[PDB]
């Protein structure tokens, strides 16, 4: 990925991303920080400004680079997809990304947007707590293995005996391959 | 094993042995109507002809009889947006011939 790359809504290694960001484009960079970032993935946020303001939403994608959240199914503009030919296809609702400080997490028990800080609770340790009230806010969120996965049991068998016996020598004692010669002195300089 | 110093043999040093060998191999579909018993690989450049016989007899246990190699030169005439030549890299190609007439065809995945 080249320097001064613009991170679009599209993921940065796509076929459609080389459409909009080819390796020769040199558009002027965009202004953005400060790693304490109270937005997680899937937060029930409410919208500060823009159109469809005041409606509350759950975000579905966060972009750390251009400070972007993607509010799920909200603040849309309608585009056509596919359509392959001289016909309409389907008009789908597509949402536009909303910037940081255009966005506020809501009160989980009260349903009001609240400014959230990081306080160090003794329970351990640094979780998102509202500033207006207490009442800490958490972070939001059947396989059966194949023929080349071992198990839950085979991963941590703890087979290691810690001896000082130099692995390339450790194979020959179990293989039983004998070597009778010795190594003569090379001039390493 | 590539990109490590090979220890040196004067006259009465031990058998040079390799533990947990570095390189990896890939078999291909031959495009130019190879005969039967001849299978074909893409050898990493720092691997010798008799080492491939030792690789396949030890790890894959297949009865190799004749190996034949070549250094397939890669395409250099491909240019970037700065008119600078971008090379697709060159690789070895080995023609392992099996023993005893095992008659292995290249299979057809993605039916």
């Amino acid at each position: 990925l080249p320097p001064h790359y613009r991170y679009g809504m599209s993921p940065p290694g796509s076929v459609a991303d080389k459409r909009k960001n080819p390796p020769w484009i040199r558009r002027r960079p965009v202004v953005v920080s400060d790693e304490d970032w109270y937005l997680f993935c899937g937060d029930t946020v409410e919208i500060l400004e823009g159109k469809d303001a005041g409606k509350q939403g759950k975000v579905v994608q966060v972009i750390r680079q251009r400070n972007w959240v993607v509010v799920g199914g909200l603040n849309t503009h309608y585009r056509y997809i596919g359509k392959t030919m001289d016909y309409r296809g389907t008009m789908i609702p597509s949402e536009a990304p909303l910037l940081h400080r255009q966005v506020k997490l809501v009160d989980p028990m009260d349903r009001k947007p609240t400014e959230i800080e990081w306080r160090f609770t003794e329970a351990g340790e640094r979780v998102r707590v509202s500033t207006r009230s207490g009442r800490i806010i958490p972070k939001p969120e059947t396989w059966i293995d194949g023929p080349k996965d071992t198990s839950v049991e085979d991963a941590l068998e703890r087979t290691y005996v810690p001896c000082l016996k130099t692995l390339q020598e450790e194979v020959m004692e179990a293989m039983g391959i004998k070597e009778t010669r010795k190594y003569k002195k090379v001039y390493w300089y | 094993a590539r990109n490590v110093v090979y220890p040196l043999y004067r006259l009465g040093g031990p058998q040079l042995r390799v533990f947990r060998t570095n390189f990896f191999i890939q078999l291909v579909r031959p495009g130019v109507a190879q005969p039967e018993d001849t299978v074909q690989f893409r050898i990493p450049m720092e691997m010798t002809r008799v080492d491939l016989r030792n690789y396949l007899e030890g790890i894959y246990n297949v009865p190799v009889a004749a190996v034949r190699t070549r250094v397939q030169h890669g395409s250099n005439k491909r240019r970037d947006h700065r008119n600078v030549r971008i090379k697709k890299p060159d690789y070895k190609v080995a023609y392992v011939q099996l023993a005893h007439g095992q008659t292995f065809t290249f299979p057809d995945l993605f039916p």
Binding site: R19, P22, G82 | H81
Partner: peptide
Amino acid sequence: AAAAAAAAAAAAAAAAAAAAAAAAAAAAA
């Protein structure tokens, strides 16, 4: 999974030179 197509890489080329002096000729006395 919306429809699109590939792209073509397309630029031009430019160069320049300057051959020699010129075209010998004649005069009087």
